Amino acid sequence: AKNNAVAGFNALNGVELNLFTTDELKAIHYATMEVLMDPGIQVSDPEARQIFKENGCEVNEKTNVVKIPEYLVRKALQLAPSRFVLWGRDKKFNTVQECGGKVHWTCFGTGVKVCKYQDGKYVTVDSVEKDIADIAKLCDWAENIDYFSLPVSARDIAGQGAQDVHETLTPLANTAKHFHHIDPVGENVEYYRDIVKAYYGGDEEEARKKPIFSMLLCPTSPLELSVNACQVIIKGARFGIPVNVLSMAMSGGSSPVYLAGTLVTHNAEVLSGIVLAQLTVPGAKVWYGSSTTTFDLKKGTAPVGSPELGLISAAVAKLAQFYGLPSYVAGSXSDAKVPDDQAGHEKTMTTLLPALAGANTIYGAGMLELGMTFSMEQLVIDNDIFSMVKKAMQGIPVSEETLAVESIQKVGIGNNFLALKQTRQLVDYPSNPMLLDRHMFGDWAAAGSKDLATVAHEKVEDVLKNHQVTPIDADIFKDMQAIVDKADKAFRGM
Amino acid sequence: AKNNAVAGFNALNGVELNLFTTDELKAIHYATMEVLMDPGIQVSDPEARQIFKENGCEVNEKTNVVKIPEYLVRKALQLAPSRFVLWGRDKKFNTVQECGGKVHWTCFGTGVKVCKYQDGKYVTVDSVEKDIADIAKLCDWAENIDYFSLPVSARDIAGQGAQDVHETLTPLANTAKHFHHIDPVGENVEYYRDIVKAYYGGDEEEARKKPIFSMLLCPTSPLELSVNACQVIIKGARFGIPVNVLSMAMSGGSSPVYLAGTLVTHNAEVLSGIVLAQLTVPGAKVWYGSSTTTFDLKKGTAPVGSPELGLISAAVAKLAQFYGLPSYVAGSXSDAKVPDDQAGHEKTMTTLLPALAGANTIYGAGMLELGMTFSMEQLVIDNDIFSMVKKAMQGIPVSEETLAVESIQKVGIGNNFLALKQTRQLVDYPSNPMLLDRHMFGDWAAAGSKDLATVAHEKVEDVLKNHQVTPIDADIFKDMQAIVDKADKAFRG
Amino acid sequence: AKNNAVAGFNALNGVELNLFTTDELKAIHYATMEVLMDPGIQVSDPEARQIFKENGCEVNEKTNVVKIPEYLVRKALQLAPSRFVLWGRDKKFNTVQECGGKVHWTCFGTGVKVCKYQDGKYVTVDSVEKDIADIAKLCDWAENIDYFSLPVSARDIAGQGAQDVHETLTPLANTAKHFHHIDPVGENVEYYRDIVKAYYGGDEEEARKKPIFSMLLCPTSPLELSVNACQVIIKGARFGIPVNVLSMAMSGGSSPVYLAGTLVTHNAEVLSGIVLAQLTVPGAKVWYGSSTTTFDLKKGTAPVGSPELGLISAAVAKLAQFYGLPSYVAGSXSDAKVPDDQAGHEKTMTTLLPALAGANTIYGAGMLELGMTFSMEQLVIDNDIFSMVKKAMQGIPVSEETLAVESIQKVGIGNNFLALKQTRQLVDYPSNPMLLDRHMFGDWAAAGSKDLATVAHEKVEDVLKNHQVTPIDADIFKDMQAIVDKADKAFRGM
Amino acid sequence: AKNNAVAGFNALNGVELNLFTTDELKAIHYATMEVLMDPGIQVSDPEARQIFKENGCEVNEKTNVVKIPEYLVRKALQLAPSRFVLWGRDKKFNTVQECGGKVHWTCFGTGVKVCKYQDGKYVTVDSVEKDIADIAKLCDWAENIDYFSLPVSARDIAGQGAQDVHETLTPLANTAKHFHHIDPVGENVEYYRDIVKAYYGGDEEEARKKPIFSMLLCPTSPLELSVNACQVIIKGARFGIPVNVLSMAMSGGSSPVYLAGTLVTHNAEVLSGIVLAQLTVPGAKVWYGSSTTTFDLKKGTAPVGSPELGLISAAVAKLAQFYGLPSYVAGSXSDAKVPDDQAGHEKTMTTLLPALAGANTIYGAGMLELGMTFSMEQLVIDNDIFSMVKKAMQGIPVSEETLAVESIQKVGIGNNFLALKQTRQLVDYPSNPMLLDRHMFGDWAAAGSKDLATVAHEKVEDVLKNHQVTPIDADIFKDMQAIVDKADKAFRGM
Ligand code: NA
Ligand code: NA
Ligand code: NA
Ligand code: NA
């Protein structure tokens, strides 16, 4: 009869992308342990220095330099959890961050401009808190955007109050998905904590168990931890708020031209932050992240739509998998000023390498202009791209059924599979893009001979006009607004 | 002192892309050997059927179905060369096609329309032998295009002369790079042989030794070998011209919806061709090719800029490496009607996968509109994209030098590497795109706020107006031109 | 949201069992190649010797010793197909034999006695043609019995006609499954070809395309190919009949005591048979088979229900996979004289090793008494055993779905999965034995306190009395039956 | 000359069985860690909750639910010893339990009924303290039974005294092999400690250095730790008594139908016990154990002679080897009510998988009726089966010697190996079962046509009548018997 008994079989599910051998991973590690001991790392916050000192680090109090011994890096790595869950106000949006290759996406964060349509053209203008609400609504709709990362700055609130706290409630209000704050303020973490506690009716345990808010911080390249960064880490750990320690080194600028050497600088900085985190509160939820890229000597810019950004982010994901931590890297980025042929290429180049490598969170969707501008058109374009990427990540599934010899035989020479029952059952198996155009020249011309950007634009308009976002309870929202008012007051009363 | 003695070290040069385990490759293989025996393959050319029969295949002379035993597949694979060199008129354009991961690129082939600027916009018009000449010049300039593949059809010669023979001399004349004929005619292969024989001053040995010409043929899916195809294979092997057996199956159409099954249909078709080739002339140069894709039931078309094409082309390179043969697959393709955001995406999606997998030749550069139109703008864009893919393929080189600890220590905390000597020696190390814009908004606007398409268009212009292509010797050209005329004369008969 | 994107993932489907490293496989091989050149093999059939000589073998005509060079062994292996299909009269019984781990089972063959209940107990008596007809019917029912191998000898025909030809038509008439003749007679192969040709209305092409008959032969240990063995090979290749070159070596008797040495003897013998085949007709369907076992120096018998037999068969399956050929090995065998506790153990020991190893066909089902007797009871029992083995061969399928963390969480602490919808959907997922009793003492005693043996017996009766077999066309049969009568007359004509 | 210089050669000693890739193991791990945090584990004992809380666990005192952070699992796994020795009164019975593949067997534990021969037939009757003594004497004789595990309950002591304490001295007295108590009482652990201390004449150090006693506890599925379990873990750790954290989950009942999901449940449960142990006393000797099985909805029982049981037990060994701990799993089990064809099969099915997988201890020998009954016949039978399993585990040793080409060449074509000197020297190499019958029909019938069951019954009678057990020193036994009396006296006064 047809067999239904197969001895042990070796299989490959998806697509494997390799950049290192264990030997090489260790080489990078040793080099990092070497850097951590000399020069070491400049920890500007005194409270952080005391944490390091207490636990074994040598601390030069006049130069603020800390030398982290390898055993503390080991201890930290054994304390950090291998996974944690990001919650949304809508449980269906909960996103998992786990060591391994489960890839997820989030939008770029955080620009100072927005790419919008004025009088028959796309004009890049300064962003305002209002823009955040709109983008939050769009991302709430975009399926492939697992959670929300502060897209643009509420520049209009600058100097007027606690802008960072405004950048907390606006997002939480305009989307039910998890919120990741790219621009947190160390001294104001208590407000973020209070906002979330307010959402959960004053129940801090609830807030800790179902965190709807997390934050990011960047070590200062090369080899420094600013006062703000140290406080974000320490307060994140103590309040139970997921903290993303993301690097921002620059090859040929703040780190070696070579990528391996750059990863070393990145590794030293990120590990220092994670160590501080675990030393403050053992078991603190943390990300091993990066947006480190290459500096373009010949242009005077730090291109982030280049193959180097893709390779570096992919490498960082491999390093996080090597260390047992969840990763958060830059991807789906571009240096193009408009949603053109360039944006498409770069977005795909910088997203595919990190995705195939297994980055747990790839951020950059919707970004344009080397991380300066945010485009709603590019956001929906990128979202559709991730759908194509997820299909590719399916690789080739090999099984008696997928080989389908009987089908090939039933059809026979010179026929077609259109009528076949198996075929009609797999009607939804192939990739089905939302915006990408797969029509004959005719149908496309008759539709207006529109390009992707314009098609995307029409999509944005529809979403913003007809998408419903799960609103926060009328009363709870007031409790939350109260915290923002309190923050603005404290800010203005100097 | 500084170390200068390290024990055995395991390294990864480049970026490795894996899609199969050996057990899965075998499973696919068995499925194919199963299909080759039942239903088997329908060979239309009687000469080919005789070749197959003479060697052991069962040939039903009424249905024309040929059943190929597995031992013949093995014999064919033991005969086919693992590598061969493609020659251009200019030795500097020589390209190797070898089993493994050495990647190369070639333009698409062959469209019927051309996307060109008209009265303020890009208008897609039908192709002519003149268009071929222009593209050949553009590609002759594009560094990441190793050899030239027939881009568009010389439609203006249809029913007026031997179109295929015109499509042979025009390319050879307009570019010093090797030429790959996508639309050869079985009966006219001798014209081609002579064209080349002429180029080498009437020396056939030199033509065989330094082939500047090669052909492509497609088995008819599912499981068929048309008369034209068998003849291209037979004469190709007999004349010493590399033949590319490239599949054109369609998931949901001529092969199962599942990619694995599709790969089986493909494997059966391509191998049957390769078997014929080796049976004809043991040692004939051949390519394990593919442009197989999926059928969008929902859009009534066959998207070729999809993640599916990329996967298929990637898997075929792996099957090729598994069978010990050079590969030629679709890649750097798109379904967009214009060089927009969509084009850039699909071009990269379909090129990155086959490239990282190690496809020896990825073709599709310059193509748009599901393989209907060719675009010089997209072509130069693609060319720039390939430069970026090549940087990506460099991966992360790990060595004491690249780890650069001493540099990190010398620069120290809070400083920068700008003035570092090592940094200045590596000024050309980073990727440096030709078209892609890496400037800030200021400088970009100050340049007219141009998108990639226009920037590219301007490049096309500059190239077509100034690039110098090494021309064939006047005398020699007459000899070749003669064969074309002779062939056209015959056509009118 | 819930993840739906995973980077390359290494998986293990089923259970893998390993016995050798590539270095050890090669070691066995070199040993084999050395033995084939010295002392070589005694080919008693002059026609086969000729075939060998013509292709390059040194043949000593006065001793019949043929030394086979390694390049011929290589040539044969490259010529032999990696797979082929065994057809039944009922296409639904078709069975694939392919290099790899696709396992299948067939009954034992061929005994000279039958274990059956007489008057209050089991009595083992010599077999008769009628026994074959009943065992064929039984096996037609048993699902895990892919095809049918000549169970016992039609001993009552001895001395009256062509017993081997009777042994062909009876099986084919009593089951619609493919028939594997274990006692073919080199000289009568033409009769078998004709029976099958008759079944297909005189179409030899159809007979070659849909083989319902295949045969087995044994090299003579140590290192000999008898005339009968050579003729079965030569004619099978020439008539398009799948031939099983199966060894019957014996550790301590016809090969070294060590199992490696034994595999070397087995290897030389089996490969010589395969070479002959491919040299006779390139591409001839052949099996790499074995029923080689160890001799019990202490008991003066050849135990076939021992771990040694299980190990040998498993190793042979690995050697077959190593050489790229389908395997046919002894398994599910016992040395017990009755279907008892010993039976169950030995049957399981000797079937599990070869199954996990990946043997393409495991024969031995129904056998007892060291290969002398066939038991219908033990046959239905073995069939049930094969179901449990098929379940075990599933191993642990690891996927997000099978890990079911949500189910565990939804059910929570101190509760059960009985009402969970997922649970009721998998009502047929667990193993469900046909005979093995899983009832509480109460229900068991209430059913008669019957042991597996008698429960098995009751099943036999039921199947024999009610199972329906697809009959052969009355007229086609007549034509086949005629071939038998013809052979019987020629036989008597001495 | 003959070679005696061979470069690096890769070899395989034994039979390797594989079920998981490292990725799959990790996947089972993450799922388990996720479950240890939500829903977490219900620890009923208040002393245990304190132990957890003190070390960083979130403990909900109202629900008694403990959430174990991944860093504590890691810590416990780093503290637990990779190996430890089980002592017997006779140093020769000392059994090592070490992370890896060194397999050992022990009898089942613990039934409520015994399967014996009354008046012409086998009758299943309730057990008594005397039955423990007998079975202990039988297991003392069985060589493949490394140590003794409380086989049946001393029911005749129920309600009239400290049953468990009687179930301690009796075993120790009736066998000189290590004793594993399957049903220890948390509150009476001090009694066991004193009994052992008594054996070593008051030297508590010796008792700790040469443990002749160890115990087992079962987490309550799903996700629960009873007061008794916790006390066993804690006292065991503090007194220096090896503790076996053994799961008893059940697919489709207290855990998901899928095997993977069931493993997760098992993991969460067992690891919680191990964490408790290490936190109580770092370095405490423990086992990663299991007897988790499937539930047959179609039969209303939890079959333990199923392929599922074998798979689960084998998986638990692989997981243990992954975590670096010694394993103790169920195997050599059957659902049959009598020692018949079924018993033999299941026993082998469920012992071979874990054995080939490397379980450090497989318990179940002598058991019948889904874990309800203990059969001395099935015990000696199982013990013999293990001897066959041990031979199978030899796999194929490949060396110039075992390949024995010179031997093959010496004997030559068509000859015999019996007379060969090498063969005579290897007469004890082949498997030599004690009960399994390998005689030709004649000799067997002459011996009575006895099946394995009856043959076993005879060996039982012979052992029980003639086997000698090294007795405990008369004086020492007095002190020991005293503790038991003191325990009983205590039981009565309440
Ligand atoms: Na796959
Ligand atoms: Na590298
Ligand atoms: Na598995
Ligand atoms: Na071995």
Residue numbers in the entry:
A (entry chain D), C (entry chain A), D (entry chain F): 2 to 495
B (entry chain C): 2 to 494
Q: What did the study's authors say about this model?
A:
The 22nd genetically encoded amino acid, pyrrolysine, plays a unique role in the key step in the growth of methanogens on mono-, di-, and tri-methylamines by activating the methyl group of these substrates for transfer to a corrinoid cofactor. A substrate:corrinoid methyltransferase catalyzes the demethylation of the specific methylamine, and subsequently transfers this methyl group onto an associated corrinoid protein. In summary, we have determined the structures of native MttB, and its complexes with a substrate analog, sulfite, and its physiological relevant corrinoid protein, MttC. These structures have provided new insights into the mechanism of activation of pyrrolysine that is distinct from the previously determined MtmB structure, and details of the key steps in the pyrrolysine-mediated transfer of methyl groups from methylamine substrates to the cobalamin cobalt in corrinoid proteins.
The 2.5 Å structure of MttB reveals that the protein exists as a D3-symmetric homo-hexamer, although based on the strong protein contacts between pairs of twofold related subunits, the structure is perhaps better considered a trimer-of-dimers. A C-terminal loop (residues 396–452) that directly follows the TIM-barrel domain in the sequence forms extensive contacts with a twofold related MttB subunit leading to formation of tightly associated MttB dimers. The dimer is further stabilized by interactions provided by an N-terminal β-strand (β2, residues 17–19). The major interaction is provided by an N-terminal α/β subdomain (residues 23–81) which lies near the threefold axis and is positioned on the opposite side of the TIM barrel relative to the dimerization loop. An α-helix (α3, residues 71–80) from this α/β subdomain interacts with the threefold related α helices on the other two dimers forming a triangle. A lone water appears to hydrogen bond the pyrroline imine and this water is in-turn stabilized by hydrogen bonding interactions with the hydroxyl group of Tyr364 and the main chain carbonyl of Gly110. Notably, the orientation of the Gly110 carbonyl is achieved by its participation in a Gly110-Thr111 cis peptide-bond. Based on the MttB structures, the mechanism of TMA addition to pyrrolysine to MttB appears to be much simpler than that of MtmB—involving only a single conformation of the pyrroline ring. One possibility is that Tyr364-Wat-Pyl334 form a proton shuttle that aids in the generation of the positively charged TMA-pyrrolysine adduct by formation of the tyrosine anion. It should be noted that the water that hydrogen bonds the pyrroline imine nitrogen in the native MttB structure is absent in both the sulfite-bond MttB and the MttB-MttC complex.
